[PDB]
Curated annotation (Swiss-Prot):
Organism: Homo sapiens
InterPro entries membership: ConA-like_dom_sf, Galectin-like, Galectin_CRD
Protein name stated in the entry: Galectin-16
Protein's UniProt keywords contain Phosphoprotein: no
Biological role: Binds lactose with high affinity. Strong inducer of T-cell apoptosis.
Domain named Galectin: residues: 6-138
Gene Ontology MF, one: lactose binding
């Protein structure tokens, strides 16, 4: 079947114990835009708060942040970038009580402490030049 059309938006309801599972392929095809971006919004509106932001600059960093009252807050940077041009990835984001646990290809890579309660997230958007197989939320 066909890759999901990006930018891809999905209405969701997150609780503690939820898991967002994103499977796709990144490619080295942009000048200074990230190759993958995942934003968790508090409304089905792109001006609303971003409880959780993850983006991938291949060979450089994975960056996580939040956008609260229009302001991009403290960037948390990983220099472990388990993403590779043209290889399929398995990105799992688990909702725990105090943090999202970010897991890639079966590896625990980062715990991002909640800045907005995850129960306020209403919409997930996955975009940048990603070839997206699936996005789904398990309870």
């Amino acid at each position: 079947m066909s890759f999901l059309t990006v930018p891809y938006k999905l209405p969701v309801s997150l609780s503690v114990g939820s898991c967002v599972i994103i499977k796709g392929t990144l490619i080295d095809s942009s000048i200074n835009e990230p190759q993958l971006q995942v934003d968790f919004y508090t409304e089905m509106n792109e001006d609303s708060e971003i409880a959780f932001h993850l983006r991938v600059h291949l060979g450089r960093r994975v960056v996580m942040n939040s956008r609260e009252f229009g302001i991009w807050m403290l960037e948390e940077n990983l220099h472990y970038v388990p993403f590779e041009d043209g290889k399929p990835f398995d990105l799992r984001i688990y909702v725990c009580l105090n943090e999202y646990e970010v897991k890639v290809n079966g590896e625990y890579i980062y715990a991002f402490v909640h800045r907005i309660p995850p129960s306020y997230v209403k919409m997930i958007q996955v975009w940048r030049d990603v070839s997206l197989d699936s996005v789904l939320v398990n309870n």
